Amino acid sequence: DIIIATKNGKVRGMQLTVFGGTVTAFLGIPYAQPPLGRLRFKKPQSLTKWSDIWNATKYANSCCQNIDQSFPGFHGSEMWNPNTDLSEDCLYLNVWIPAPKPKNATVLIWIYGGGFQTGTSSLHVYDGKFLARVERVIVVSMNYRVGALGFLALPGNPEAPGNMGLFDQQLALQWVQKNIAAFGGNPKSVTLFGESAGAASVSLHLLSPGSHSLFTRAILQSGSFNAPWAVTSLYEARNRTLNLAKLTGCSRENETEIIKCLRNKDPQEILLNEAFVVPYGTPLSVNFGPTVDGDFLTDMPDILLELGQFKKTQILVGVNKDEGTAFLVYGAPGFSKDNNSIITRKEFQEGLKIFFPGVSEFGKESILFHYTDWVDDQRPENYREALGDVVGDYNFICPALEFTKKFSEWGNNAFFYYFEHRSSKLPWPEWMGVMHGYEIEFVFGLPLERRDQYTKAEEILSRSIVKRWANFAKYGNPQETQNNSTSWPVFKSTEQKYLTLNTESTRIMTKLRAQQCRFWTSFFPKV
Amino acid sequence: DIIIATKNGKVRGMQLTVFGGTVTAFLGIPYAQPPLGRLRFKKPQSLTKWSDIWNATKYANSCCQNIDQSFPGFHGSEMWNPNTDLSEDCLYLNVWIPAPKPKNATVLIWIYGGGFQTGTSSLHVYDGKFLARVERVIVVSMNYRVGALGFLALPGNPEAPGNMGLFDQQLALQWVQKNIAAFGGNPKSVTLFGESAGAASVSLHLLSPGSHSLFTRAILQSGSFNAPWAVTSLYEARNRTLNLAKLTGCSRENETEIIKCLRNKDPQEILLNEAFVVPYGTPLSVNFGPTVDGDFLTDMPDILLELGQFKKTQILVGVNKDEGTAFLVYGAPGFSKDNNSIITRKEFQEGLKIFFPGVSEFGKESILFHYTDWVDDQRPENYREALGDVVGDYNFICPALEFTKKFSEWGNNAFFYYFEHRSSKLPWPEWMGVMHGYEIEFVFGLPLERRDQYTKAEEILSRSIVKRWANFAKYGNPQETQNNSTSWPVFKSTEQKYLTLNTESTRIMTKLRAQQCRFWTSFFPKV
Numbered sequence A, B: 001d002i003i004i005a006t007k008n009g010k011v012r013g014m015q016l017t018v019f020g021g022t023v024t025a026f027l028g029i030p031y032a033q034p035p036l037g038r039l040r041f042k043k044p045q046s047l048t049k050w051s052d053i054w055n056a057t058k059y060a061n062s063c064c065q066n067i068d069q070s071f072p073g074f075h076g077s078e079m080w081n082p083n084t085d086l087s088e089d090c091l092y093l094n095v096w097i098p099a100p101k102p103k104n105a106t107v108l109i110w111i112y113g114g115g116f117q118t119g120t121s122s123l124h125v126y127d128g129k130f131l132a133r134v135e136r137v138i139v140v141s142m143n144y145r146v147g148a149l150g151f152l153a154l155p156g157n158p159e160a161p162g163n164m165g166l167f168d169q170q171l172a173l174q175w176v177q178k179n180i181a182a183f184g185g186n187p188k189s190v191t192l193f194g195e196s197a198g199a200a201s202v203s204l205h206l207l208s209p210g211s212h213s214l215f216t217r218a219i220l221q222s223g224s225f226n227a228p229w230a231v232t233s234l235y236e237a238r239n240r241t242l243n244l245a246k247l248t249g250c251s252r253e254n255e256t257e258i259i260k261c262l263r264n265k266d267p268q269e270i271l272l273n274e275a276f277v278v279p280y281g282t283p284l285s286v287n288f289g290p291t292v293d294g295d296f297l298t299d300m301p302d303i304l305l306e307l308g309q310f311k312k313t314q315i316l317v318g319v320n321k322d323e324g325t326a327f328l329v330y331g332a333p334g335f336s337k338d339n340n341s342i343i344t345r346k347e348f349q350e351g352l353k354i355f356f357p358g359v360s361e362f363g364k365e366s367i368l369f370h371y372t373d374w375v376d377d378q379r380p381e382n383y384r385e386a387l388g389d390v391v392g393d394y395n396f397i398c399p400a401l402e403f404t405k406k407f408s409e410w411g412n413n414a415f416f417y418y419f420e421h422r423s424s425k426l427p428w429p430e431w432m433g434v435m436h437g438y439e440i441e442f443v444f445g446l447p448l449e450r451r452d453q454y455t456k457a458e459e460i461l462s463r464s465i466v467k468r469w470a471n472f473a474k475y476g477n478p479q480e481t482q483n484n485s486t487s488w489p490v491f492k493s494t495e496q497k498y499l500t501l502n503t504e505s506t507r508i509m510t511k512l513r514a515q516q517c518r519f520w521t522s523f524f525p526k527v
């Protein structure tokens, strides 16, 4: 039996055998009042205190969210869909601890991605029991509200202030500050880590005054708040909040009434209308996301970044070789996960319309000009490869590289990885290559489970990443020091050295996508 | 009609249409007295002067040499065998000039490889008419004596001093100094270039006082004089000269008599006995090569290199990704060009005996230790891949990298390439990868001939190399400046930046084979 006393009550966890050893798991600990009724659209309210033993023995409800129905029965897509009931009562977290109870363990806090519209901490690829077993860190993950329920904004007004779901993450970092010593954890050594929108989240907690003292270091996998999808403008957020009201017949004139009306709606009615709050979107649409709210976020975060207004600490930042591909089967003409997707120039062109909706014509010609100077015009997969690079360079790679540069210019050590390994078990076709989202199972150690059909070179690869991730968290330095590993150089403006992660040989390289990102970074923002 | 007047007489060349243009070719110009009879084994003697018109309208005789009979009918091997008659009367050279006659053209002088035992300037892959047409440089190549006829040494004695075939190259560089203005060439801008033994040759002319003022710059492709096969010791050279005498019944006691006897032998008798002058050799045996003769070479050239005693000028130095593979089918157990050559640990072991004949047992275990720490022990082509890396790292790659470092430490600009492209037309099997010898056709522009079945990406690749090679020669800087090409950084000790040459993207990388060459370079020389 394993009972830990927390500030709000006792909690019982469960034992798990992992690799001939044991991890204790406390799945489903609540960390705020359920955000129902009067609390819907508001900042999470702190938790009341319960006598008796809360049983943390299974994953909790995931937050309400639309589901990916594009490929029913297909594991590639459905592995991302929620795997516990949806409910507004989803404000729970998970703790995994080494056995025996560590004395003062480093803490890794996972923040999932999903475009801020979806996702859940209980996915199999986010299971932190391998990290606990293997590295003897503590792993914490949390559910936070996504979609309108988590990010609806009517700026300035506490009935729907914006950013609630970032406040959910925050209040969870707080629970770790107050509660994690009880579990053997060191609150003074906490590293946040997250992928995609979860990484953008990590980057904004680097910017948020309220989060500054709730963690030590940050890891950002395929995401940063300067990505084009990551922050909704005040303009767009209002449009969207009013468009939502309109669609649920909740148009009022007293904004406080719009909200009271929206709180009478039922979760499905709200969910059902999210996709149409925008005239057009893309497979990468973030209808309801982070906004400048004057609370969590005090100013446009591009301004905060440029002017050095963020927590000073080491960062680890990374991306995957084919970020963009996964999106092309969600609406680009001629693409399919069921064939090789050789598209035409005219298809490439119609695809830019898919991903770059408004979108001066000259903007889009400029993307075509930059990405279609073939070397040479012979290769039939030319336009298929260009569309994916366009999508992942614009959306992930250049914004992560620009974040890393700017961040590092203020004096902190920063390490950048280029993930190039395609999973031996990937269900998506070969042409989609090293996809967005598919480093996560390496980071979490799923390939250390031999029962599991990954190659030997994949176990070794993941053991190494685990070790680098954990050394980063405990010591601010992502080195694997024991096995004659390539040394991971800090990333500096000027050199921009990054490390490549793959099964064959890892390399030190410089200036990832220098030519592409000059385009996205200097020129495109102008169109 | 095209007649040029030279210091020794007039010479007539022939016109050639290349790429809708014209190159003049003067194939077969003699540059020394034929080294027959009394002259066999002696330094080339200067040419007499002829009235009338010498017709330079076909390639001349190749020098006497053993031929590769391992794969009769096989183009991969037979493309290297001589393609003009063998004769001792082989001291000729070739000049290719742009049409119209250039005014003061940069000169590229090619020196072929072949282990110093074979080779000829008239191979199809050494045809300089594309370089002349495309870059408007002048291309010169020369035959020089190989085997015992070119390198037999009985140190100190002018009847067989050693290095005759290096003196043949030299006297040819001289003919260019005296004669090339006549052809529109600039004697003050000459770059030597050569592959394998031809590159080792280029590196020794960097060391030879007599060659200092006969050229401007040097290019070394897969070869340098510090390679283990490149310089025969005084010890070994005598053994070999006496062993040769012995085998032809020419043992005497008056060394001048040994030689007179050897000059009565006929070329075949000499050729026929070369292979056995050593108790054992390897596929990489250089029975009769360069020696320290106190004339061409004044001291062990490792000492000259270390202590900065070489011509001060820019160098371009390169190697191919799979240098070693080509040698494994010439005697390593379990290898064959006709299958995938998955060998066993015990085969790998017997192969080290093939390539490392004497060869402490501990020496060889040490190679096995360094090269067989698998990552991981699963992969069936593990030992096949290790044997080739062993062979090419020991024989080519580390010695070229060490030459480049040491050379550059004295202040000169140096550029290093890593050639990684496998020819679409390679006849050797896939497992032998990017083979030794197979950059040459890219350097010489054979892929610019579209008639010819190379891919489009190969034309582009070769056009770029041609341009970099030619800019290096004319301007000491191997940049392709017009087409947004990756800039080629100088190679410094400390950084050791090199440029990768391939069809996809060229890269800047650092410290090629750092771990391997620490082994070959610091440790192995000790065993």
Ligand SMILES: *[C@@H]1O[C@H](CO[C@H]2O[C@@H](C)[C@@H](O)[C@@H](O)[C@@H]2O)[C@@H](O[C@@H]2O[C@H](CO)[C@@H](O)[C@H](O)[C@H]2NC(C)=O)[C@H](O)[C@H]1NC(C)=O
Residues within 6 Å of the ligand: A239, A243, A244, A246, A247, A276, A277, A278, A279, A280
């Ligand atoms: C800000 O919002 C308006 C609202 O328009 C929308 O009405 C919503 C309830 C929803 O159904 C949505 O799909 C619909 O478009 C946008 O105005 C619309 O914009 C498009 C193009 O400008 C027009 O074709 C529509 O006719 C127009 N609708 C109305 C009623 O005015 C507006 O575009 C939007 N701003 C953006 C681009 O985000």
Ligand SMILES: *[C@@H]1O[C@H](CO[C@H]2O[C@@H](C)[C@@H](O)[C@@H](O)[C@@H]2O)[C@@H](O[C@@H]2O[C@H](CO)[C@@H](O)[C@H](O)[C@H]2NC(C)=O)[C@H](O)[C@H]1NC(C)=O
Residues within 6 Å of the ligand: A332, A333, A334, A335, A336, A338, A339, A340, A341, A342
């Ligand atoms: C690769 O498949 C795409 C996707 O479209 C198809 O999915 C296939 C696997 C098959 O079931 C097909 O019937 C289904 O429609 C193909 O793109 C489609 O091309 C077809 C041909 O006319 C068009 O009708 C569709 O508009 C277009 N689909 C969309 C909406 O994008 C594609 O042609 C196919 N190409 C290959 C084999 O390279």
Ligand SMILES: *[C@@H]1O[C@H](CO[C@H]2O[C@@H](C)[C@@H](O)[C@@H](O)[C@@H]2O)[C@@H](O[C@@H]2O[C@H](CO)[C@@H](O)[C@H](O)[C@H]2NC(C)=O)[C@H](O)[C@H]1NC(C)=O
Residues within 6 Å of the ligand: B239, B243, B244, B246, B247, B276, B277, B278, B279, B280
């Ligand atoms: C220096 O040369 C001697 C000569 O040995 C050789 O006789 C030649 C004419 C030729 O046929 C060659 O194949 C033959 O070996 C070398 O002596 C020989 O070395 C090996 C191993 O040491 C012995 O097994 C031989 O019996 C021995 N021969 C004689 C007659 O002494 C000697 O090895 C060589 N040095 C090297 C290693 O290059």
Ligand SMILES: *[C@@H]1O[C@H](CO[C@H]2O[C@@H](C)[C@@H](O)[C@@H](O)[C@@H]2O)[C@@H](O[C@@H]2O[C@H](CO)[C@@H](O)[C@H](O)[C@H]2NC(C)=O)[C@H](O)[C@H]1NC(C)=O
Residues within 6 Å of the ligand: B332, B333, B334, B335, B336, B338, B339, B340, B341, B342
């Ligand atoms: C790949 O081939 C090698 C080379 O030997 C063979 O060449 C083959 C293409 C075939 O004609 C064969 O008969 C010829 O001998 C094989 O290595 C050989 O292995 C055989 C099997 O007993 C031995 O008899 C030989 O000693 C050995 N040859 C030598 C001298 O190296 C090799 O086994 C084959 N392996 C594969 C298919 O991976």
Ligand SMILES: *[C@@H]1O[C@H](CO[C@H]2O[C@@H](C)[C@@H](O)[C@@H](O)[C@@H]2O)[C@@H](O)[C@H](O)[C@H]1NC(C)=O
Residues within 6 Å of the ligand: A103, A104, A186, A188, A189, A190, A216, A473, A474, A475
């Ligand atoms: C646990 O260690 C505490 C501090 O450790 C951390 O120091 C921080 C500044 C940060 O660098 C982390 O990465 C370090 O690990 C110490 O003050 C506590 O008292 C310790 N608590 C125990 C053992 O109960």
Ligand SMILES: *[C@@H]1O[C@H](CO[C@H]2O[C@@H](C)[C@@H](O)[C@@H](O)[C@@H]2O)[C@@H](O)[C@H](O)[C@H]1NC(C)=O
Residues within 6 Å of the ligand: B103, B104, B186, B188, B189, B190, B216, B473, B474, B475
């Ligand atoms: C031809 O140019 C001559 C010198 O050109 C070279 O200068 C050298 C020092 C070297 O750098 C080469 O790479 C240069 O190209 C000049 O002195 C001759 O007079 C010229 N001859 C002519 C035009 O007839």
Ligand SMILES: *[C@@H]1O[C@H](CO)[C@@H](O)[C@H](O)[C@H]1NC(C)=O
Residues within 6 Å of the ligand: A055
């Ligand atoms: C907590 O789980 C344990 C199982 O042993 C048990 O005491 C009890 O059923 C649980 N408490 C509940 C269900 O509230």
Ligand SMILES: *[C@@H]1O[C@H](CO)[C@@H](O)[C@H](O)[C@H]1NC(C)=O
Residues within 6 Å of the ligand: A254, A256, A257
């Ligand atoms: C709007 O009416 C609502 C009713 O609760 C109230 O929240 C708010 O004070 C009113 N605002 C004004 C002053 O119009």
Ligand SMILES: *[C@@H]1O[C@H](CO)[C@@H](O)[C@H](O)[C@H]1NC(C)=O
Residues within 6 Å of the ligand: A460, A463, A464, A467, A480, A482, A483
């Ligand atoms: C270090 O090496 C051992 C044995 O070579 C291996 O089992 C282990 O996976 C390595 N550890 C790390 C941290 O990569």
Ligand SMILES: *[C@@H]1O[C@H](CO)[C@@H](O)[C@H](O)[C@H]1NC(C)=O
Residues within 6 Å of the ligand: B055
């Ligand atoms: C040189 O070639 C030309 C061909 O026109 C001719 O004058 C003559 O036959 C040649 N001289 C010889 C063969 O010595």
Ligand SMILES: *[C@@H]1O[C@H](CO)[C@@H](O)[C@H](O)[C@H]1NC(C)=O
Residues within 6 Å of the ligand: B254, B256, B257
């Ligand atoms: C050896 O005899 C030859 C005969 O030509 C001669 O070259 C040389 O002077 C003699 N050497 C001596 C002094 O034994």
Ligand SMILES: *[C@@H]1O[C@H](CO)[C@@H](O)[C@H](O)[C@H]1NC(C)=O
Residues within 6 Å of the ligand: B460, B463, B464, B467, B480, B482, B483
């Ligand atoms: C430069 O570019 C043109 C057109 O893009 C091409 O035809 C040519 O091969 C290039 N030249 C060099 C030196 O590579």
Ligand SMILES: *P(=O)(O)N(CC)CC
Residues within 6 Å of the ligand: A113, A114, A115, A116, A195, A196, A197, A198, A229, A283, A284, A286
């Ligand atoms: P991520 O959360 O996967 N996301 C950024 C918006 C890609 C949809």
Ligand SMILES: *P(=O)(O)N(CC)CC
Residues within 6 Å of the ligand: B113, B114, B115, B116, B195, B196, B197, B198, B229, B283, B284, B286
């Ligand atoms: P190269 O001339 O090909 N050579 C160096 C000895 C390899 C046989």
Ligand SMILES: [Cl-]
Residues within 6 Å of the ligand: A375, A376, A377, A378, A379, B456, B457
């Ligand atoms: Cl092409």
Ligand SMILES: [Cl-]
Residues within 6 Å of the ligand: A484, A485, A486, A505, A506
């Ligand atoms: Cl490594």
